[PDB]
From a paper:
In this study, we incorporated a Cu2+-binding site into a natural protein domain, the 58 amino acid c-Crk-[name], to create a miniaturized superoxide dismutase model, termed SO1. The miniprotein was found to be a strand-swapped dimer with an unusual coupled binuclear Type 2-like copper center in each protomer. SO1-Cu was found to be SOD-active with an activity only 1 order of magnitude lower than that of natural SOD enzymes and 1 to 2 orders of magnitude higher than that of other low-complexity SOD protein models of similar size. SOD proteins disproportionate superoxide into molecular oxygen and hydrogen peroxide and are part of the enzymatic machinery that protects the cell from oxidative stress.
Residue numbers in the entry:
A (entry chain A), B (entry chain A): 1 to 58
Write the structure that this text describes.
């Protein structure tokens, strides 16, 4: 809901954002392992996390 | 739902994934401009897109 707890260790890294043009059509990838959230950790660092690697905490 | 249409041009680039440890607690950032989807374009390129920059097409 508001908070999650990590089920595994995870090593930081980058992911790329698609470039696209106005009016371009895109298909959404809906497999669970491809879903991400924006998160913030105890030290204020912000970044993406994979939903499948965490669980609802609060 | 399944497909989106881009409302603006968007230049490709990277975003970082948080590193975290098993059991660590994280807060989810829920502002609209921080939400992303996984998408695929006409040429098979895969990448992240910002929800606020597109609209439901199909
Ligand atoms: Cu990833
Ligand atoms: Cu961007
Ligand atoms: Cu971005
Ligand atoms: Cu990762």
């Amino acid at each position: 809901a508001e908070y999650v707890r990590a089920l595994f260790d995870h090593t930081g890294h980058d992911e790329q954002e698609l470039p696209f043009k106005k009016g371009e059509i895109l298909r959404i990838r809906d497999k669970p392992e491809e879903q991400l959230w924006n998160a913030e950790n105890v030290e204020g660092k912000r970044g993406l996390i994979h939903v499948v690697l965490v669980e609802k905490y609060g």
